[PDB]
Amino acid sequence: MKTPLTEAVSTADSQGRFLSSTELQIAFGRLRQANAGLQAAKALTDNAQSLVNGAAQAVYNKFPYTTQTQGNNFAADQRGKDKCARDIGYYLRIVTYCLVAGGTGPLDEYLIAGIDEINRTFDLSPSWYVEALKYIKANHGLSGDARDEANSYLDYAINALS
Amino acid sequence: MKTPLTEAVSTADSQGRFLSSTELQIAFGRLRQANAGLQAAKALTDNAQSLVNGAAQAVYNKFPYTTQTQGNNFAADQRGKDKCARDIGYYLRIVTYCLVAGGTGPLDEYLIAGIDEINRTFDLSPSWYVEALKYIKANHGLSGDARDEANSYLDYAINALS
Amino acid sequence: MKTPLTEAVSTADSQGRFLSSTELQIAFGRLRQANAGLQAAKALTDNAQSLVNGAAQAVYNKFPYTTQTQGNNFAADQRGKDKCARDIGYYLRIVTYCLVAGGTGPLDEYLIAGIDEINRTFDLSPSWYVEALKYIKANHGLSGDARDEANSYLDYAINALS
Amino acid sequence: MFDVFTRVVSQADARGEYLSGSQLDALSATVAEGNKRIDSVNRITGNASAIVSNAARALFAEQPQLIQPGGNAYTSRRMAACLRDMEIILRYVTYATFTGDASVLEDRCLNGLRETYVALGVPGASVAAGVQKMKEAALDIVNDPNGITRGDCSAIVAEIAGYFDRAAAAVA
Amino acid sequence: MFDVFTRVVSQADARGEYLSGSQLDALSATVAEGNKRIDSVNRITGNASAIVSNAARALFAEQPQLIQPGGNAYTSRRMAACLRDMEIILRYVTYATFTGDASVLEDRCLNGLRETYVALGVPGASVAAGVQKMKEAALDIVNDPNGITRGDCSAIVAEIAGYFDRAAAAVA
Amino acid sequence: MFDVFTRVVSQADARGEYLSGSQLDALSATVAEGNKRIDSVNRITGNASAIVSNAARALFAEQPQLIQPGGNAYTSRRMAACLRDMEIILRYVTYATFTGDASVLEDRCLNGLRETYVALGVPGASVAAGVQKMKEAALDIVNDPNGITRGDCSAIVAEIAGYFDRAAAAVA
Amino acid sequence: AITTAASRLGVAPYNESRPVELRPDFSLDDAKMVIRAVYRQVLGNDYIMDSERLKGAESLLTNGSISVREFVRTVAKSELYKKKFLYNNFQTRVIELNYKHLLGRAPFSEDEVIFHLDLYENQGFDADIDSYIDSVEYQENFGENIVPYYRFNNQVGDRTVGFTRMFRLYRGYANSDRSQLERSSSRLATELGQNTVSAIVGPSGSNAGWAYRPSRAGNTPAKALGGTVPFGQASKLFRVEITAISAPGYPKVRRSNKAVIVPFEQLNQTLQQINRLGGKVASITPASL
Amino acid sequence: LPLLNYAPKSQNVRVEGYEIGSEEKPVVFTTENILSSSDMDNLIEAAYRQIFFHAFKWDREKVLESQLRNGQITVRDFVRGLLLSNTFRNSFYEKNSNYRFVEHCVQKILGRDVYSEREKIAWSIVVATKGYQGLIDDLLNSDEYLNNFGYDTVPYQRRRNLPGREAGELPFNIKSPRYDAYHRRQLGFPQIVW
């Protein structure tokens, strides 16, 4: 699970070496970031309901057929709408994990590995989620390092989907 | 050369991945450190002569047989004193490189790798160089992050010699 | 394996005792017996084919239905006759072992333990083997201690079967 | 591999010299540029998919022979390999940008790549054309003034443009 | 492997929950200790050779059977392996301190180590004594008040002590 | 457990064979040596305490690390256990001598013994030394020409030597 | 029964022993034999020092004031038994030991752990000890007058898993429950929880690979899921357990114990490679069908 | 028949390197570290990179992955599975001569370049005589493979860089693309453009 601290140790262990100033600087880099990430995670968490419901609507608006067409993969009934809001919630929650962990680890572990297989198997369009992730980017109201780190994880997922 | 920036890229490349928030944090840790490292490099360089001179004398005093015993490996003639001062100068200079690079890279590539073979082959005692490194440690008069990083490189060399 | 030497040790071991004069007396008893045992084994071995073939015929004469009745458990065919001769040979061979060992050990270990299950499962009469063993008692031609020890094992087997 | 700092060290060691005051001051100026360098790497990385796909689209629109039957980007695997390669080159350019030195890009991507493509029959000139299009888009993304502390990134942008140019020269 | 942050994340994903307010504030408190944690890792690392060699010297002085002819640490190859092992264990303890989680130590070092030692005939109780001596030396070095900004490192020391305790228990 | 006779019998039964003439003759020759076997057992037994205590004294003189504080043979309990081990190995060697087959030694005395010593940290090479010391004393006792019908016992003495060697190898 | 493998499994001495019964109107030598047997069985062949003997219980046994079973009960409840087996052990370890000492067999199922852990927790150690001794199983095998003994051989009421687990608890004749490689660790916690078994590894002296023990994590599963496909052309797969690997040295060698699944067509190469690793084969078991 | 004899040639891998861990030391991907799911991804990706240079979804071997993840097989077994895979046969065997196929195998499996044409020549006959699997097994069972990578480590190109140098020897995935001039001609490339 990629984070600065585990990557530092993973590299040193591969080399059979004690941690050196290089790894200590890695830790200092993490400490420089941690509070901004934690504050970003808090802000996303407290606004999570609004962001998720806003994102779902943004998808429905950009892709109207998803709420009009019948089929297990679409959100034309409350069942499909609940699935869609659930999924967007998953993306949001795991992004908050990345902010806490300081790395894409949680996204790699919990969401990204296998997402292609899911989307193909259940006939879900990656474009839908890309739209949802853009809305979250545009509406989380973060600033400074909180914004930059949050957007990088949101963009990481978008690039994984594209 | 092992540094925070080259290790960050090495990690990402070994995973076939673009750099991510984890590696960007590594670069911030490098930036937090770099100015102190450059100031330390400057301080050691300005004082290089007296540190090298003093370090050699510390060694001759701790190990008087080196200035009194005949033999290619000892410093009982000017030839040997020059080699010894040269060697100590190498350690000091390469340590300044580590401060500039922000890692043990320069020490590893220019000095440590193979140092056991040399010391065995030419019958040089590692304890001589440890004493010199302790002298430089106790006489570089750095403080704060410059001290801590500089000492990490001196201790890294001392550890390699023992 | 019930033999004088092993049981002496087994008993002594269960008592956590070094061997004492009691066990040594057992060894002397074994030594008094062994040569006659070995000679009895040799005589039975040299005569084995006559004894086994003679024993089988004694069985077939005494129980003529065994050579006339169809069935896997009878000797009405060469298959059954071969099984019968094999079986008697086992008795004879393992009896020679008891003479070598100086105890019923080999008969217990190899033949007696479980024989009742075998004869029940395969519908073989113990009376058949009693008659074979009696023939061997009558016809081995031994005397003295060799006869007495040999007959004890043949009777041990007979008692086991009845 | 070298980075901006260790490049100077390697030259100094070859001379047996401490870094001069001007060399130390120069690296200090590099440090003062560090945030812009990080922001540029982050911006290219975050738009990597679009940079590659938009550049590839334009490349096949300008050179339709590549995707017509019998072309070197025709069939799904060849097209997939082509898109992959563009992303590889972009990835190593961001590495070079991150380290501030071209060694990783050359040692791990470009050195020998011309022969690779000649052996395979890949039109290296067309690869260079695609690299140029990624460069154009990438520099525009780096220079985008919206949503970032305003400042002058001309120096870093020129460096990035150089790495692209090095890549474009190397492939053909 | 887990670090202090991803350990908490793992337990949260298992329940499908955002980290609670108190959990986020707990991690902030961990961040506030970050410098103390780095210093402790740095002090142990800087003294690694002495920590190992002094501990080994004390071990063989107290348990001379190890180094008598026929003792497990007799012969150069076995003594070298023994010194190596103590350094390995100390190294992984610093890894665990650095991450703030025992997973690296437990997974990469202690897994199957008890089983390795019994299979080779290495006396694990004597390994554990060595770890104890390294622990004692390591904590004194970490607690050394000279040459460092003054503060309370009691919590980091307790954590480090815990990692040594795991190592000592695991080897036997 | 086999004795000398049933060892041969078990091998024959596994092959379905009668013992051959030579095998019966070999056992006859074994019987003829019976009195010397019994004597040898009686002599080792009659001197069991002195053999054990003298070997133990010599071992601890040569290996004082065993009995100093912290040593494996330090404290009355461990020392008593150590002395029991010596007596037990010697007892089973007399069993092996009495039966004329190593099986009693293998199946009982040496079955699991190495695991015991590794689990406990008993220095197995030290036990081997003790067993070697008992062997020397025991062989001298068996060989002593005073107060016994004179004859050549080299064959039984070689057999007894083997049993001691088996025991020593099992722990070293 | 166990005949061919008896000696290498450490069973031969028990094959050669009879149950120790105290007959009515027993002699003093009878009483001494019972006392010795009970100390060896119930205390797991630990050496017993004269200061540790239960002299009063021995007197009462000798006098006929307590039967064999009540003497066993007294030994099992003594401070000596508890010091050896209770105060320093995980309770699952305690239950394993109780089964071995008092019933001569290994636990069959997780249900036995549930029962005895709750009984200990609710009513205390003495109550738990009584449950073994007053059990139907104890009554049927040993009754009032026979010292408990190892039940290696198949009996009515057995399960196969019991047989394999006895060699996790019994490690040979010249050995004690407190002098085994796993030391204080429960031998069966994982087997019981997962209802799994392990390849049998006999005692040292008669088995070169006697020390093989798996690690906490990163073990090779017993069966070859996927068959021979990953190996290419292969007729059948075997799981080989290997111990004492040292030769390449760290970091080339990390764990000295390893289990590998290899195809029939590579067994020659595997044995050759193992030998050059210095390792000793602990067990080989078919891994595919 | 015994393998045709050939002589070695001076190579970095043939001499002691006095290596100290740096950014140019190949990352050791081993299962002896008890790798988490995401970390196992990286090991699997490294193996695909080492053997295929790149595994499109079509190329990937999900069942082999599951078996490696579950401990059914070692890394060396996973590597064998990749070498036996459809992707490897189609990309590197069928599109090359036996001689170039041998080179690919030596580079990918042993992590070194071939000594000479004679080494390539000597091994080129193995597929025909021992079969495709026989070639792979010989290389994977070789002292050279086992001494360097053992059973639990992903192979990698060995001693490519020397300390203090700006560049090392060419990475094998650059030096040795899956096919070369022979197959290039059959495909009718290079394509005239402009």
Ligand SMILES: *[C@@H](C)[C@H]1/C(=C/c2[nH]c(/C=C3N=C(/C=C4\NC(=O)C(CC)=C4C)C(C)=C\3CCC(=O)O)c(CCC(=O)O)c2C)NC(=O)[C@@H]1C
């Ligand atoms: C217990 C561990 C001891 C202790 C530690 C302690 N350290 C700080 C503060 C700092 N320590 C560092 C460390 C480094 N700076 C570098 O550049 C490097 C080399 C790569 C290292 C290892 C830093 C950066 C700081 C912060 C700035 C400062 O110098 O103070 C503190 C203060 C609390 C804090 O930082 O939050 C403490 C307490 N102090 C003791 O008394 C223990 C013996």
Ligand SMILES: *[C@@H](C)[C@H]1/C(=C/c2[nH]c(/C=C3N=C(/C=C4\NC(=O)C(CC)=C4C)C(C)=C\3CCC(=O)O)c(CCC(=O)O)c2C)NC(=O)[C@@H]1C
């Ligand atoms: C090597 C072991 C030494 C040796 C032995 C030896 N002994 C004999 C003969 C006999 N020894 C005995 C022994 C005993 N008689 C008893 O009543 C008991 C007590 C229970 C014992 C132990 C016996 C019965 C004999 C036979 C009669 C006799 O007195 O000789 C011999 C002679 C050859 C033979 O095997 O009979 C020998 C050689 N002799 C030595 O010189 C060795 C030091």
Ligand SMILES: *[C@H](C)[C@H]1/C(=C/c2[nH]c(/C=C3N=C(/C=C4\NC(=O)C(CC)=C4C)C(C)=C\3CCC(=O)O)c(CCC(=O)O)c2C)NC(=O)[C@@H]1C
């Ligand atoms: C250059 C092409 C463009 C540009 C860049 C620029 N950035 C800064 C300053 C900062 N940028 C960052 C970046 C991050 N903070 C984080 O936490 C992360 C996520 C991991 C990133 C990427 C930071 C930390 C700073 C410093 C503080 C600040 O918020 O300003 C500057 C200002 C100068 C400086 O060096 O700080 C500039 C110029 N600005 C442009 O206009 C270009 C389009």
Ligand SMILES: *[C@H](C)[C@H]1/C(=C/c2[nH]c(/C=C3N=C(/C=C4\NC(=O)C(CC)=C4C)C(C)=C\3CCC(=O)O)c(CCC(=O)O)c2C)NC(=O)[C@@H]1C
């Ligand atoms: C039609 C069902 C829908 C549709 C099609 C569409 N496709 C593209 C672009 C491409 N199509 C392919 C496909 C192939 N190339 C091959 O070589 C082969 C195998 C022989 C296949 C199947 C590819 C590779 C591309 C991209 C490159 C190219 O342009 O040739 C587009 C344009 C996409 C773009 O961004 O330019 C479109 C429109 N679109 C619909 O809406 C239809 C329902």
Ligand SMILES: *[C@H](C)[C@H]1/C(=C/c2[nH]c(/C=C3N=C(/C=C4\NC(=O)C(CC)=C4C)C(C)=C\3CCC(=O)O)c(CCC(=O)O)c2C)NC(=O)[C@@H]1C
């Ligand atoms: C896209 C703009 C153009 C294009 C590309 C193209 N490339 C290949 C095949 C390969 N490319 C490489 C490249 C690399 N290997 C390395 O190690 C590195 C550095 C990390 C690089 C950049 C390799 C090795 C191959 C062959 C192996 C493979 O494809 O997996 C192809 C396909 C050729 C084939 O069938 O092998 C293509 C199509 N082609 C165009 O027409 C565009 C101009």
Ligand SMILES: *[C@H](C)[C@H]1/C(=C/c2[nH]c(/C=C3N=C(/C=C4\NC(=O)C(CC)=C4C)C(C)=C\3CCC(=O)O)c(CCC(=O)O)c2C)NC(=O)[C@@H]1C
């Ligand atoms: C004598 C020439 C000089 C000297 C010796 C000295 N040696 C040590 C310590 C050790 N010596 C060894 C050597 C070996 N151990 C082995 O097993 C073998 C191979 C069979 C050898 C050659 C070792 C391993 C040690 C360290 C461990 C131990 O104590 O046994 C010391 C003490 C070092 C210390 O710090 O305790 C000394 C003094 N010293 C001189 O000044 C002499 C000129």
Ligand SMILES: *[C@H](C)[C@H]1/C(=C/c2[nH]c(/C=C3N=C(/C=C4\NC(=O)C(CC)=C4C)C(C)=C\3CCC(=O)O)c(CCC(=O)O)c2C)NC(=O)[C@@H]1C
């Ligand atoms: C002193 C009052 C008299 C005396 C003493 C004496 N003792 C021994 C030998 C041993 N003494 C012990 C005792 C202990 N070992 C332990 O570990 C502990 C518990 C912590 C005790 C109490 C032992 C075990 C021995 C034998 C082994 C050894 O030598 O260490 C001797 C020598 C006996 C011999 O045969 O070598 C002596 C002389 N003797 C006197 O006459 C004093 C009046």
Ligand SMILES: *[C@H](C)[C@H]1/C(=C/c2[nH]c(/C=C3N=C(/C=C4\NC(=O)C(CC)=C4C)C(C)=C\3CCC(=O)O)c(CCC(=O)O)c2C)NC(=O)[C@@H]1C
């Ligand atoms: C004495 C020369 C060395 C020594 C011995 C030592 N052994 C133990 C403990 C045990 N020894 C045995 C051996 C046997 N038990 C048997 O029943 C049999 C015959 C079948 C044998 C061979 C066992 C099983 C044990 C463990 C049981 C127990 O109660 O200890 C110890 C005790 C270790 C300890 O208490 O921790 C000792 C000291 N130790 C040395 O240092 C000498 C080299």
Ligand SMILES: *[C@H](C)[C@H]1/C(=C/c2[nH]c(/C=C3N=C(/C=C4\NC(=O)C(CC)=C4C)C(C)=C\3CCC(=O)O)c(CCC(=O)O)c2C)NC(=O)[C@@H]1C
């Ligand atoms: C007969 C077709 C084959 C055969 C069988 C055979 N088995 C054994 C010994 C044992 N069999 C078992 C089996 C079980 N125990 C259980 O608890 C269960 C379920 C309740 C089963 C199935 C056991 C445990 C043993 C050993 C213990 C005992 O027998 O009491 C043997 C004897 C082994 C020996 O003597 O060493 C044999 C012969 N053998 C063949 O060759 C046939 C193919």
Ligand SMILES: *[C@H](C)[C@H]1/C(=C/c2[nH]c(/C=C3N=C(/C=C4\NC(=O)C(CC)=C4C)C(C)=C\3CCC(=O)O)c(CCC(=O)O)c2C)NC(=O)[C@@H]1C
């Ligand atoms: C409660 C907070 C959580 C929980 C607990 C739970 N535990 C079990 C089962 C067992 N617990 C133990 C524990 C011990 N055995 C000992 O010897 C000791 C020390 C003296 C302890 C603490 C054992 C051995 C078991 C197995 C036997 C048994 O089931 O009682 C269960 C049952 C598991 C099952 O599948 O039956 C449970 C539920 N479970 C949760 O979800 C809580 C977080």
Ligand SMILES: *[C@H](C)[C@H]1/C(=C/c2[nH]c(/C=C3N=C(/C=C4\NC(=O)C(CC)=C4C)C(C)=C\3CCC(=O)O)c(CCC(=O)O)c2C)NC(=O)[C@@H]1C
């Ligand atoms: C020193 C305090 C004690 C000691 C050590 C000792 N160890 C070995 C051999 C090995 N030790 C290991 C250890 C590890 N492998 C791992 O993966 C890790 C965790 C990352 C560790 C700690 C291994 C694998 C071996 C075997 C391979 C090798 O020898 O390098 C020996 C030598 C054993 C031999 O029989 O030659 C020794 C001596 N021995 C003592 O007596 C001290 C108490």
Ligand SMILES: *[C@H](C)[C@H]1/C(=C/c2[nH]c(/C=C3N=C(/C=C4\NC(=O)C(CC)=C4C)C(C)=C\3CCC(=O)O)c(CCC(=O)O)c2C)NC(=O)[C@@H]1C
């Ligand atoms: C010493 C008198 C001169 C000298 C030597 C020098 N050599 C190298 C590097 C290498 N040398 C070899 C040699 C061999 N490879 C083989 O297989 C064989 C036969 C077994 C030989 C002799 C190799 C392959 C290398 C490169 C790999 C490595 O160095 O580890 C160097 C280092 C070059 C560098 O840039 O590091 C040097 C210094 N140099 C002089 O100045 C002397 C004249």
Ligand SMILES: *[C@H](C)[C@H]1/C(=C/c2[nH]c(/C=C3N=C(/C=C4\NC(=O)C(CC)=C4C)C(C)=C\3CCC(=O)O)c(CCC(=O)O)c2C)NC(=O)[C@@H]1C
């Ligand atoms: C889906 C209906 C259910 C489900 C499945 C599930 N399985 C695993 C993990 C594994 N599955 C396998 C199975 C195979 N591997 C093979 O090679 C073959 C034979 C050709 C089979 C059948 C294996 C070996 C594993 C473990 C290794 C791996 O991860 O691939 C998981 C993952 C569990 C985990 O992450 O640890 C899951 C989810 N799970 C359900 O809940 C469904 C009922």
